[PDB]
Design a protein around this nucleic acid. Structure first.
Lengths: 90, 90
DNA sequence: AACTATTTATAAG
DNA sequence: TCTTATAAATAGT
């Protein structure tokens, strides 16, 4: 956008609340497209600072969660650190 | 990118596999940033066309899924259709 | 495994 | 492998 930003908690309770809403949609949109382009099933679960729930699922969310729990092989399992680290590599 | 593309299953088994890998990271990156910018907890579950698993979580993924299962209020619960619709509105 | 032709999202071959 | 001014993602070569 107009300015570049440093990933860090927006201290401003409002721009935070606004950015959340905006990006959340972007996130879901992407998820949507990825889901579709590549014939994959996606589930996305979000909890805002106030522990309120927002969820997207390409299909049948609980169906996906169920598959998940039953999975028994190793697999890509990233976390925030994994991500920051992968980033710094570039 | 160089060309605009229509959201639909990449029929080319290869460009599909490639695009999947690329965008998946983009997805996680975003999720990462959202998680951080806005102090929210995020869990992302992906299954490729071949039923293999990929997951990101801002923190303790199972902790998040657990919260989810226990939630009992109505909440934003989007799905692909909800998304396409919302798009066409623009 | 790069590259790269205001940064589509988002902050004020 | 809500409006632009700008950053950040990415299709394709």
């Amino acid at each position: 956008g107009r300015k570049k930003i440093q990933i860090t908690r927006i201290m401003d309770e409002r721009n935070r609340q606004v950015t959340f809403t905006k990006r959340k949609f972007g996130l879901m949109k992407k998820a949507y497209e990825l889901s579709v382009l590549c014939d994959c099933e996606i589930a996305l679960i979000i909890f805002n600072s106030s522990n309120k729930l927002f969820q997207y699922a390409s299909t049948d969310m609980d169906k996906v969660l169920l598959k998940y729990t039953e999975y028994n092989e190793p697999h890509e399992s990233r976390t925030n650190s994994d991500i920051v680290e992968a980033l710094n590599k570039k």
